[PDB]
Design a protein around this nucleic acid. Sequence first.
RNA 1: UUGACCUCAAAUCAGGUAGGACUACGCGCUGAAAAUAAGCGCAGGAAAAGAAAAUAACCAUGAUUCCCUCAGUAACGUGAAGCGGGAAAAGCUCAAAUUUGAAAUCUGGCAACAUUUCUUUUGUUGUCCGAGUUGUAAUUUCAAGAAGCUGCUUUGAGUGUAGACGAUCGGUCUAAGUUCCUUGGAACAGGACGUCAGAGAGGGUGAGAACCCCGUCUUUGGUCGAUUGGAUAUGCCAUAUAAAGCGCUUUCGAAGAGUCGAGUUGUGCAGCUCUAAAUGGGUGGUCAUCUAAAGCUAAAUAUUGGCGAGAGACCGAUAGCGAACAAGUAGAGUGAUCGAAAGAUGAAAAGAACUUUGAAAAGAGAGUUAAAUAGUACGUGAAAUUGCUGAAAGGGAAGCAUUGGAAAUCAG
RNA 2: UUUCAAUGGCCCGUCCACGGACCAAGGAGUCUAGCAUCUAUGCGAGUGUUUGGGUGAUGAAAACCCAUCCGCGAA
RNA 3: AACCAUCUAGUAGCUGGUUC
RNA 4: GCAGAUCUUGGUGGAAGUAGCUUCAAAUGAGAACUUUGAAGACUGAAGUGGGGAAAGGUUCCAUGUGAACAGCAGUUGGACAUGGGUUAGUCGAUCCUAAGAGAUAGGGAAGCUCCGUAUGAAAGGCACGAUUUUUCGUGCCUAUCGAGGG
RNA 5: AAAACUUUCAGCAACGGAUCUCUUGGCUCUCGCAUCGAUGAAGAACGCAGCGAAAUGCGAUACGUAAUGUGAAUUGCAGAAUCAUCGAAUCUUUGAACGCACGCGCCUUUGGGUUCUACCAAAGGCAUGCCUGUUUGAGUGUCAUU
Lengths: 71, 70, 208, 118, 125, 121
Amino acid sequence: KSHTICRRCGKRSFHIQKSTCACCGYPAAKTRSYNWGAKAKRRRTTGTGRMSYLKKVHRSFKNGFRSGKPA
Amino acid sequence: ANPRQRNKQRSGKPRLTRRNANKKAKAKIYGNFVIQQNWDKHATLRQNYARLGLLATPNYVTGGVEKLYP
Amino acid sequence: AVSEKAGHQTSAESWGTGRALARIPRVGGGGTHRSGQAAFGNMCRSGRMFAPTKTWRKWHVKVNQNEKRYAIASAVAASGVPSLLLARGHRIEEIPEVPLVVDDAVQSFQKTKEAVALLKEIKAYRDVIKVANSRKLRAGKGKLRNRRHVQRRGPLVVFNEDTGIVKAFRNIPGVEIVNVRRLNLLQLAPGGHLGRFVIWTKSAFGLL
Amino acid sequence: QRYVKTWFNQPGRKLRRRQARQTKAAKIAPRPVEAIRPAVKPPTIRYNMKVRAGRGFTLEELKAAGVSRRVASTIGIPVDHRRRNRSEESLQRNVERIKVYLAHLIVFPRKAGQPKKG
Amino acid sequence: MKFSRDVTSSRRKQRKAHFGAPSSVRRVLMSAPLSKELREQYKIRSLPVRRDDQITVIRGSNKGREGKITSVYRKKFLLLIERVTREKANGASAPVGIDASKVVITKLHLDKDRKDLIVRKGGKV
Amino acid sequence: ALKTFELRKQSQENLAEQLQELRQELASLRVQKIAGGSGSKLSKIKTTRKDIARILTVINESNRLAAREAYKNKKYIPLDLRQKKTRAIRRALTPYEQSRKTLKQIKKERYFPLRKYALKA
RNA sequence: UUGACCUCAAAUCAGGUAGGACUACGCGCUGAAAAUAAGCGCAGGAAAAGAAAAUAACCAUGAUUCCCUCAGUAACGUGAAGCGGGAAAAGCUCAAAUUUGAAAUCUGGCAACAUUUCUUUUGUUGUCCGAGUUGUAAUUUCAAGAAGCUGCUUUGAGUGUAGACGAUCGGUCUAAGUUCCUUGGAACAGGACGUCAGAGAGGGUGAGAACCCCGUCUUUGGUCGAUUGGAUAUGCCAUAUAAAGCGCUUUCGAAGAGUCGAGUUGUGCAGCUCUAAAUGGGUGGUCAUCUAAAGCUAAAUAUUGGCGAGAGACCGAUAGCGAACAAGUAGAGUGAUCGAAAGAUGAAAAGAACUUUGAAAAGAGAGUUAAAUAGUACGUGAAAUUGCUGAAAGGGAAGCAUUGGAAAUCAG
RNA sequence: UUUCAAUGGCCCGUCCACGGACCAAGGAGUCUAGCAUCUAUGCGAGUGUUUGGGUGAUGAAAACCCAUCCGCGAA
RNA sequence: AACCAUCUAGUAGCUGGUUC
RNA sequence: GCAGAUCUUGGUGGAAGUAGCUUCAAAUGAGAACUUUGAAGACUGAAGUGGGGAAAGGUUCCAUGUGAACAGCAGUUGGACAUGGGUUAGUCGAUCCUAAGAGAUAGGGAAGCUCCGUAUGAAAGGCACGAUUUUUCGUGCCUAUCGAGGG
RNA sequence: AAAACUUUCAGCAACGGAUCUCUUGGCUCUCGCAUCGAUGAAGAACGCAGCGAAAUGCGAUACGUAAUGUGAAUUGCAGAAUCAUCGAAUCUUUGAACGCACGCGCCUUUGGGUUCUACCAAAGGCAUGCCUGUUUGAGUGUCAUU
Ligand SMILES: [Zn+2]
């Protein structure tokens, strides 16, 4: 074998000998995604997961990020 | 189409429907109380200014004027 | 317009000449039903269409303002020939006279009973009934596209000032109310066919 | 003939700007929507026979007309520290532009500050 | 004519909204008219259906039948009324659902939660 | 279904023990499911599994209100208690700081503010 | 022997901040076979630009951006700009001059006191330590200005209360047939008789529903809120021993350097070599115009991404997004990447009880239904293609054409 | 309509050769800028509103109205 | 050197087809 | 608007049913050439077609039921699916160590992603003593990290 | 000139899934708005319902909790809601990813045991670059002290 499970992107693209995933470039702090690969971007970009926090924020913007308790 | 908009198409969470559109969004007047009483919530601002006797602009109007009667 | 990113995405190029197959770009990869199949051409399934529709077509057409005004004056004049009204399709065999003018007290209505009441007194109500019984479901794909119903055209009420005349006459099927100062061609000449039945309030007529 | 600019938003830009005019003056009612501009001569031989609106009244125009630089921007009379009157004609055409303005102006009184003592 | 930009007259969006209505909104789409004697002494025209309310089926093959609602089956926009049923093949009895607009109400299930609503919607009690 | 208004007027250790009790039956209730149980007991698992949530929510609300009062009117308070709006909202200029003007800019709008006027016609 | 400092460290020191993502539009930088793509860095709801080291040669104009025009002109197939018309308009801040009769300034610790989208937010007051004279405030910005003299006109970085007025979040209220007759499983259909309409948009309901239901109109609004914008009235405090505008001058007027620039090199800017001045310097045609080498700034403007809406002479399941469906899914490749097919029973499962044959699969009876020519291999169900039935012809072609007979069938 | 007899009839497209097993659906002179001619319409030494401003309550991206400029023509 | 997605619908003087 | 494009996608033929791919008894079972038991005969002949491991795979292991897809035949069969069960450590291995090298840091390049560097012009780790020393610490000594044969 | 076989015609059946009608989807235009993250984001992995594998929701408080609103359900079988709203919380292993590595430590406090100088558990901590301040310092850096 040549590739094992990447820890940041989950795909078995993590080349053991280079210790760098081909899919997402872990362990570089950034993420590997090029403009010529537009399909590759859409396969992974924001929206293909839970977005548990952004859904929290988008919901709380309508009322103005208020804090407190109803009277 | 975007994964992001596919998320809330295949999700079960209701949208954030925000009800905003108003045909003829003629902004109502605050500021001076005298004008706010004698404003016409239908007619346009350049009609209302000329109705009250207030010059809407001191400079020439870069287009046509309104002539309803000969 | 179709998407300009359509047909362009799925990857394929020519396989080479001399392999008992046509030379279309055929998708790569394996294990999927899509593999080894052609696209990029109007003649392939899931293929880019020929001359994909653009949004910078010529949607609006310039017309000399003078022949616009010639058209309105011609269509207003045709609104005053009873014979042209009949071919246009208006049941006005009992209309008192043409042009059918009404008192200026009509411009201050407040209810649709009053509007319908007045129309029956001047025998123009034969035309509201026509456009009510003709109400048909559309034929074809138009009804799938927020164009669910079709019907005829009733009498055209023209006024000089609005005080409640529009709010009274608007809900009646077929009837359209227009200020005299903003006479519209699409209502003086529907379909391009002259002589729509018009009703003039007293002031509106005096302002022609 | 690459990327095109197509004007389908022309009718909606017409109203967006109309509503901005409506929104603005509704915030500042009694006062006009626009400032007074001077009348200036275009700087060419094809255009020096015409009169057009300037950018503001020079320092001397306001000094003769009777307003100082500080109180002239409050009541809505833009100043133009660049422009300058090279001939008595432009001075008189714009001095009497402010004269009719100051006659048609109703400066509302503000709130004063009155300390308990002197 | 809907003069508002606030509401959509798209057919596509009106069917998606009807068929994606949550129970707290389906509860309004399941209204029923009030019978003549109910209508005149409460001064209200209709009401959303509630369990135990007594209704009579106006339209359908079960025309003229009466009965008590057992459960307003809200997921499929159906009302299951007692002692109206269809007989299955094997001999079981599986009630069929009537639509809330095809039935009229002759007796209500008055509660302090309903009483406030009746006077809320311009009524009297 | 323990009403929350009943719980929230209890004591801390009183809520601590009821939670200790509430683990036992739910621990026992699951034991009967693997060994076979009735429909009523199986449905009762869900109600108890929410009743643990109701008690635990009440404890935290009480515990954090204690910190909020204990930290009331202090310069620095725990991060879990401060505003959580947006990283950019927190690092942006406060209205007091955006309102700040130089003394020169306070003399300019003092003696020469914007006037309210009107053009006659 | 003791101390000032200067520089440099260390700490799980007190409090903070940076990173990664998205990238439609923004600003850079790098760069191919167009200053393009790809690459790299960096932001915001806009960014950038921006109050002239600007045009012009006039009777002069007057920050920036954007649109039209200039104009396919000028200059050299590339491809301007000023003027002109519009949209929008808003101006300003430092360094360089002694506060010298007073570092007048600010971070932080603690202590209190209030305030709050908010117990989450934001400050004031006192007090101690420090920062800072190698320069923190006040003053000044070239349009000027300071310092005197003068005599007129002005002044709150306040805090409560109250009402009106706009802005947002949520809740809440809404007209009139389900009346008869025929069709049908079903009346939403046909006819009769009526109503409502500021509502005859759309959708749902067992078939074309303004009057069954949700809505639509009223609503450019009533109602209960919950926060708020800016003005108005009124109360309470107020450092005014002050601060500011404009006349006048027997006084003065600081203005940004390894930067401008000259030589050469890389494609206006940049590298190297050299290196300025003070009516000086820059740019234009002796005159004109601007005053760089420091800074900030709304709006008009862009917006294939985000959060929502409203549409359409669009497509209608080989179409339209790759995806109307469990779609970036099954799947393929070590990997980067690649990547599909598949919508419709019926008004309602009423999804075929039961008997019988069969081990089972199933069949045959039944039964459900308006319909099983609707049985989940489920709307309609074409052609190719096949099986049977009936008719016909066939000796190493058939197919077709014209003319008629035979049989079949239709009309007038 | 089917069959029979009499006479006749080389397999289509393409440039011998190349294509064609059969069927259903899909499938190719389109949109756009400039120019030229011609015909029609409006006006006529004039002509062109739709960069903008005004206005439009009822489909308000429509219609309707217009100031200064500017394009072409008038040497 | 091979491979991958882009540039890219690269390049046609030519081959084949082009619908009542 | 299609008869063609070695057209595209889907279906469908002819070619063609063509090319082609151990024995006996008993028991189970609706059904026995492929199942089971006994019986003989063979084959592998310890370099096994034997018994174990490592990687690898991931449950294929075991029990029960089934015979829809797999099975170039069939099965009463399977690695098929259906339904459950099964891996127990103070002493066995890993975890503990280093080798060649990789390699963060100190630094230095680079317009930049990044590059070099690991002994490098690095303030790079702790030990003891003492009536307590001005009730403010004096005196004395010594000089990273991952990586499988070692335990 | 019989039957078959071959072919044509018609009927029925098969195969197939065209045509038609539909359509919670696409695409295109316009409009309004500005809101990610060291207070742990985007993404990844594991996990949760009485019976769930997908998808959705959610995080050991796991198809949710508190609050407010509505006012009687859910549905496939056996102050409600597989409801709305959303100002309170919970938010496992990771990931910029942060004690060190891809299991091993250190630090402070607290607890347990019919075992208490041992063992164990728990809670809270320990990344780097930089900024302000603080405290502890270094220097044959500068200089002072009758
Ligand atoms: Zn990865």
